[PDB]
Every structure is written in structure tokens, then in C-alpha cells.
Amino acid sequence: HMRKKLKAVLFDMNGVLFNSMPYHSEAWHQVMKTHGLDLSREEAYMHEGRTGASTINIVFQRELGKEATQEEIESIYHEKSILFNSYPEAERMPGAWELLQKVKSEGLTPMVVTGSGQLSLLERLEHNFPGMFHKELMVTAFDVKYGKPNPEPYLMALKKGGLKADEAVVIENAPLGVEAGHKAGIFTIAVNTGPLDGQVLLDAGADLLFPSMQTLCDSWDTIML
Ligand SMILES: [Cl-]
Ligand SMILES: [Mg+2]
Ligand SMILES: [Mg+2]
């Protein structure tokens, strides 16, 4: 009985609200390439949600047979940031305004649940989506001990919203994020907005898979009944 119970829709940020993942992927792929290391564009999408350190160490361990130092991690992350910021500013994901407007018109409360602490994207939420969100109904990197795929960010969103899990749905693009929503016990919709096989998102625990935000918006009525 989803129409009766649903109160809130918990949106991830990168790859759901903002179309920033082509730029994060390119920056990771290219920084590693300049260091002579192979991290494909598609693989960078797999690691969406991991810390810079964890991502870097995955590549360092498999290619060089060793961990990166803290000095190597800090410098590669700086390099990645320089590259990312040299690209155009990320636009709103097509379909994101539309789905937000649709759920708002149904009396649902949008929330943001992001692993970002990147204040360059975080500050842009209010003014890219005016009236959609409330600062008190947002979860960012600043609010949590463990990021996705740990369920903590989604469990914290339920707490901030005064919600039970059966009163929310999660909208996620990334396998680690889908895993977090599922492990939080919330009905989780995957939107496959990048180059990954959609099966990866189903295997991470998504209850439904859609190929894009606009497709989900177009199908929202069919879900709810
Ligand atoms: Cl590639
Ligand atoms: Mg994401
Ligand atoms: Mg797609």
C-alpha cells in the first residue's frame, strides 16, 4: 500500500539531481592516466561513493602491489579536483526537476541524501532547486560517520524526517548507493544514468530499475498504484 504510506522521496545528488558523474568519471580516469595507472571511465562509476583514499588504493594495490601514501592520496585528490573544476559546471540532470515537481504535487516531501561534502555542489542545491528541499531534511558527508554503502546516511534521513522505512523511497544511480538504501530497509529505485549494466544495480538490491530520471518520472503513476 505505497500511496497510503509514502511520505518522502530520498534523492541521491550526483547522477540523480545533478549530471555530474561524466565529469567525476573523466577526472578520475584522466588523473590516474597521467600517473600511468588504469582506471576506466566505467570503473569510476562503479566506485561512486568510495572515499578518494579507497578508490586510489584499489588501483595502487592492483597495479603497483602496494598502498598509496597519505601524501600520494592528498596530491591525487587535489589533481582530480583541479581537473573536475576545469570542466563545465554540472547541469541539472534532465528529468530531476520534473520528478521533483511530480512528487511534490502528490504531497510527498523531497529529501537529499548525498555522500558529498564538496561544498561547490552542495551550496548549489538550494538555488538549482528552489523550494524543493529543506536544509533540515538533508543528509550530507558532514552528517555521517560511515558513507554509502553503509545504510547510515539513509537511516539518518529517516531520523531527520521522523519517518519509518515504509514511508520512504530511495532514488539512486550507483551500486554502492543502491546497496545503502536497500540495507536501510527502504524501497529503492535505481535510475541507470551512466554506462553501467543495469543488472549491477539490481544485484546491489534495487527493487525497480529505470534507465533515466525522465523515464522514472513518466512511469511514476504506474509504480504508486
Ligand atoms: Cl575508459
Ligand atoms: Mg549518485
Ligand atoms: Mg540509462
Side-chain angles (χ1 to χ4, degrees), residues 206-219:
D207 298 278
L208 294 171
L209 174 66
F210 294 88
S212 76
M213 289 291 279
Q214 189 64 54
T215 303
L216 174 55
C217 189
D218 295 346
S219 294

Side-chain angles (χ1 to χ4, degrees), residues 14-25:
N14 293 325
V16 169
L17 299 175
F18 286 113
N19 186 28
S20 57
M21 289 305 300
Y23 299 158
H24 288 294
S25 169

Side-chain angles (χ1 to χ4, degrees), residues 26 29 38-43:
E26 195 66 20
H29 164 74
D38 180 26
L39 174 65
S40 74
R41 294 168 175 94
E42 199 179 309
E43 207 197 335

Side-chain angles (χ1 to χ4, degrees), residues 6 66 91:
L6 213 55
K66 64 178 154 77
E91 71 283 16

Side-chain angles (χ1 to χ4, degrees), residues 191-194 210-212:
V191 294
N192 191 11
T193 57
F210 294 88
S212 76

